[PDB]
Amino acid sequence: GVLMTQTPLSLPVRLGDQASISCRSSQSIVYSNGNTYLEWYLQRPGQSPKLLIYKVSNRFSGVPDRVSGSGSGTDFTLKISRVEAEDLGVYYCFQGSHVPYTFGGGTKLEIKRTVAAPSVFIFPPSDEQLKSGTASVVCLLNNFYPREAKVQWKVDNALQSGNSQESVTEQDSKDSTYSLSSTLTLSKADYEKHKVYACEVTHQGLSSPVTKSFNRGE
Amino acid sequence: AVGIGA
Amino acid sequence: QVQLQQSGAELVRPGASVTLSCKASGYTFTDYEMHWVKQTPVHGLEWIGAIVPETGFTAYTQKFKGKAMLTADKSSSTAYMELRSLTSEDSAVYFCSRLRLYWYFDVWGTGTTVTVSSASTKGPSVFPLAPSSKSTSGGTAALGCLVKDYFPEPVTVSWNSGALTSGVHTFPAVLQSSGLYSLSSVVTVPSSSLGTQTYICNVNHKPSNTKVDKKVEP
CATH class of the missing domain: 2.60.40.10 (Immunoglobulins)
Incomplete structure (x- = not known):
């Protein structure tokens, strides 16, 4: 044809x-x-x-x-x-x-x-998932440009590798930005083994890295 | 398209 | 209104068959041909073939002969495409489209996702991403749902039964090491409204016939 x-x-x-x-x-x-x-x-x-x-x-x-x-x-x-x-x-x-x-x-x-800096949010695991024996912590980066961004998970100041996944949205059709969601997943045993959970965010629109964190048990 | 029926 | 309503997402074992349906609404079914189009990330859009409902005449691109067979039912105004002896290369999204003779593909169907796999279906767990002081920015709050551990793709996610669309980011799913998918859907809302508005994520996993509503609270 x-x-x-x-x-x-x-x-x-x-x-x-x-x-x-x-x-x-x-x-x-x-x-x-x-x-x-x-x-x-x-x-x-x-x-x-x-x-x-x-x-x-x-x-x-x-x-x-x-x-x-x-x-x-x-x-x-x-x-x-x-x-x-x-x-x-x-x-x-x-x-x-x-x-x-x-x-x-x-x-x-x-x-x-034009460059647009991310808005960073962090979500602790829900009680509902913790009853199942797993803990997922979610770091959200909203409406940034350009697409390249760095998420680093820190658990009690120790940098994490091998226990997280992330994905990026398609380019937004009205403001031409992207968003990224990153999920840190641990066993409930390991999660109750540490206090401070942080995601550090590096992006061209931030003058210095932005950290969002929480202490387990508030 | 023309269509397969033409 | 003109409408082409397609059937929902399918999970089909290798070597089996599946029939996709496309029901026409708001116009005379026999006055248009029905065309079928395959969509994959690897090959983009492919014309499969078409049928004339009034006579049952069909035509196909050569590679789909013996793989697809098109039929039409005038009594129900529904066109059908049967896919036979499925392999992994038949995983795709399939669209139907109408065509008046000498015109164009002006109205398209919603699209049907087919996943060829020997694995069993699994419905998702749905966990709140609860808004807190760690998810506020500029007088605004982020909240969402973690849709986790489902197979296969896709899930559809809506908020407040479709009443909420502005500010929603539903991320592409990631494939966990378990072989199950995980996805996040998030929305940005006013902080002042959190005590007065209600936010419910509606998760639908057609292959497992699962529907879960989750109310997300601070």
Whole structure:
């Protein structure tokens, strides 16, 4: 069938700047009348794909005029004249002229913004989980940029390794930040074996590391 | 798309 | 309103079969073709094939022949995709989409997650992430739920039966060394309101038929 090659695979763009995504087809995708069923779709994580452009250059209802499409021969381009925070996601060209229909490989758009420092929170384990014999302590970093952040767990001033897990959210669609959740899990026996639980947070937006801590038993 | 029925 | 309602998340053993459903609402089912699209992190979006409900005619990309089979039931306005003799490469999220002839994929289904695994299902435990003086920032408070020790993915998390969406961060799940997933969902709320508002996280794990509500208190 028709191969759709998309470029680039990831496009980092500053807010307010211009974005251009290229799609190329291995063969002509003109349908027998001279119409070309070239479409563009956007998918944010956790959501369904959304139609943007149809027939090379036509905007789907409700798509802003800063998004436009064009193409001649086997080359097609999606363009965003002023990237805004809600444009983040994976863009796909789609060929609808020849069965079997085919997508491009996708282009992840990633938004650049000014540095924003995390808000740090800590949660002690609940009594409910402690009755089951395990203790999980959770350190939360809310709405920071850029994505790189350091979480270090300290238990009575001893740096921890090997007992925590973390994950980062996808980029936020309105303020272009990220958030991170880190979980420190110990046996209830080990947890009642120490007093002070701290997560130390390093990030470009903090002038010095931020520590959030609590003493077991208040 | 055109559709598979065309 | 136009709607395409898809069935919920599935856990299927290797070599078995599963049927995905997509029920149309708010338009005449026979006036549109139904298309199916596979989504994975590794291959992005893939067209699977389509069916014409009015005649039962189908078409497929070659690699899905013998793996997917599409049917439609006019009496219930529901399209079906059966996936047969499943392997680990069939783990994905599957979407349905409608198409009027010569138009486009304007309405998409909610999406169905399929996990092919020989392991048994496990529902999550849900623990409060109680707000405290250690989770306040700028007159604001963080609180949440720890959804722990479930298999497989995914869980859906809502707050106050969907009445609360602003300020919610539901993190990607991590895979614990036990082979069970763990996830955190957090929300930022006014500090002054903590005594007057109630915050309940609603956790739904379809593969185990589990629904847990947790009220989170200081």
